[PDB]
């Protein structure tokens, strides 16, 4: 969470969220009159895993997303409505993309599953979609895993399966594998 409290109109959406929904009860209106200010009176870091939702709840950009800081403007992004595989809730999300890059992930309204809230992991895991990515087929050799074409990898898999028979073939599915 990035803070520009100078831009803060004193609604209480962040405080009400932190109390009723998040339940960490960290934010409050400290002060009286015009110099009243919003935030933890002590130096504290927001501990809830629903912390990202205050950014969306903030109408006037006083609370903003630090990972998504100064990177793009709203009009530049194409939004596609998809679901979050971070956990089995299947939170409905809108992925905003510029070109070939995912820029930010925000929730969608679905009273059935996620009212309008998104967990921090789902919200901020798009960063790991740009790192340690697999782009090409790799076949192992004496020099290690090396670049190979699709045909060569399939040939190696065929030569391997030829040896195995019956229950010697084993499949392990992952957390993010899809039904198809």
């Amino acid at each position: 969470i990035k803070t520009s409290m100078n831009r803060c109109i004193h609604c209480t959406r962040c405080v009400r969220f932190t109390h009723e929904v998040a339940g960490t009860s960290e934010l409050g209106i400290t002060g009286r009159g015009r110099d009243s200010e919003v935030g933890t009176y002590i130096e504290k870091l927001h501990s809830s895993e629903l912390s990202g939702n205050v950014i969306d709840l903030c109408p006037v950009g006083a609370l903003l997303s630090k990972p998504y800081a100064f990177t793009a403007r709203s009009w530049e992004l194409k939004g596609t409505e998809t679901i979050d595989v971070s956990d089995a809730l299947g939170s409905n999300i809108k992925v905003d993309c510029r070109g070939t890059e995912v820029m930010r992930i925000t929730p969608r309204l679905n009273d059935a599953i996620n009212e309008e809230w998104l967990s921090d992991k789902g919200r901020f895991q798009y960063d790991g979609l740009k790192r340690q990515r697999l782009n090409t087929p790799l076949v192992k050799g004496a020099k290690g895993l090396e670049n190979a074409t699709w045909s060569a990898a399939f040939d190696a898999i065929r030569t391997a399966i030829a040896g195995a028979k019956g229950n010697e073939l084993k499949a392990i599915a992952g957390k993010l594998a899809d039904a198809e």
Binding site: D56, P59, G79, K94, G99, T100, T106, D111
Partner: protein, 162 residues
């Protein structure tokens, strides 16, 4: 929800006076003169959901909204980076036409347009939005109700204490 009472009045009235002649599905696509491989592309008919940043209801399907909100969109295709300047390059002719200009008032209108041109389509209904507050905070009075901690116990009273 009542009425716009502006040019939209004459727009709707022109809509209801006139009508289109029925033709077999896909016949108009041949008349269009575009490459026939265009109609091999798949269509998604959907209404955008509300952006989470803003609380306005204009973009949503709400009685306040008087603008067309159902889009025909085509599936996303390959995009790469220009080797010289890193610009986003594409070969998809239908990249932005559907998002930008294909706006329809009603789902049946977009379905009719797709069937008339011969595009296969899948209609996605928006998740229903009901403006119903929860029972705990149904009203402003509920904020200061006895529900918070129960009715005040009077066992602290000096008469009850003594």
């Amino acid at each position: 929800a009542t009425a716009p009472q502006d040019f939209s009045l004459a727009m709707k009235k022109a809509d209801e006076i006139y009508s289109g002649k029925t033709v077999k599905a896909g016949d108009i696509g041949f008349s269009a003169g575009v490459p026939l491989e265009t109609y091999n592309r798949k269509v998604r008919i959907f209404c955008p959901a509300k952006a989470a940043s803003q609380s306005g209801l204009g973009r949503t399907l709400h009685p306040s909204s008087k603008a067309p909100q159902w889009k025909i969109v085509f599936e996303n295709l390959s995009k790469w980076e220009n080797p010289l300047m890193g610009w986003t390059s594409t070969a998809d002719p239908l990249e932005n036409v559907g998002r930008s200009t294909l706006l329809f008032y009603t789902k049946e209108e977009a379905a009719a347009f797709c069937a008339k041109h011969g595009w296969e389509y899948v209609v996605d209904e928006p998740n229903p939005r009901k403006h119903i507050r929860q029972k705990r905070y149904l009203g402003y009075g509920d904020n200061y109700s006895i529900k918070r901690k129960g009715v005040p116990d009077l066992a602290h009273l000096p008469s009850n204490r003594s």
